[PDB]
């Protein structure tokens, strides 16, 4: 109901048959009635495990899994104590973020 333009929201609805319904252009017919086994592609929320990386990524501690915390402004934010393993400073460095797409990878990422 929130739609794809209001966080927290959703962008796509995938039925059990594999059909994908775009939330945009779909409100004219009203909200879709969900059924068990369907997939709702929703915006990453707080506490969602994500993989945070910085190249060249010379060792395994340069790529670690974090918990999402949606915030204002256009910059990533991370604790100071975890900068040494990443070998990163805040003089302009950029870091990459990856979002797991399955429960298995979601649990694997957060437990290892």
């Amino acid at each position: 109901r929130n739609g794809p333009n209001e966080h927290p929201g959703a962008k796509y609805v995938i039925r059990d048959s594999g059909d994908r319904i775009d939330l945009r252009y779909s409100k004219r017919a009203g909200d879709i009635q969900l059924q068990y086994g369907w997939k709702v592609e929703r915006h990453i929320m707080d506490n969602d495990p994500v993989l945070f990386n910085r190249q060249p990524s010379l060792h395994k501690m340069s790529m670690m899994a974090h918990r999402v915390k949606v915030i204002p402004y256009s910059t990533f934010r991370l604790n100071l104590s975890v900068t040494s393993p990443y070998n990163a400073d805040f003089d302009g460095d950029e870091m990459n973020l990856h979002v797991p797409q399955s429960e298995e990878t979601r649990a694997e990422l957060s437990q290892l």
């Binding site: 068990y36 086994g37 429960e103 298995e104 979601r106 649990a107 694997e108 437990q111 290892l112």
Partner: protein
């Protein structure tokens, strides 16, 4: 089946590994998310991963880990009989 070691002479570690625990929780969490029957009493919980953790703690996961050996032989270990010490 000469590649299946009988339970009487299993020589692998009786402790579930971190990798085994990670996959067991993920595999069970995925099944729960796809409307699988929960075999543990729920005191209020919606996250499939958390439900899986509760099942592992009470040893109510009906899965067995087939540990492979570098020659093709394997040993079957039930999740219930594997000690979770890590």
């Amino acid at each position: 089946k000469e590649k299946a070691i009988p339970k009487d002479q299993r020589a692998t570690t009786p402790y579930m590994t971190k990798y085994e625990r990670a996959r067991i929780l993920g595999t069970r969490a995925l099944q729960i998310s796809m409307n699988a029957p929960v075999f543990v009493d729920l005191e209020g919980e919606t996250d499939p991963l958390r439900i899986a953790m509760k099942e592992l703690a009470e040893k109510k996961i009906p899965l067995v880990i087939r540990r492979y050996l570098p020659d093709g032989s394997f040993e079957d270990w039930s999740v219930e009989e594997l000690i979770v010490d890590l």
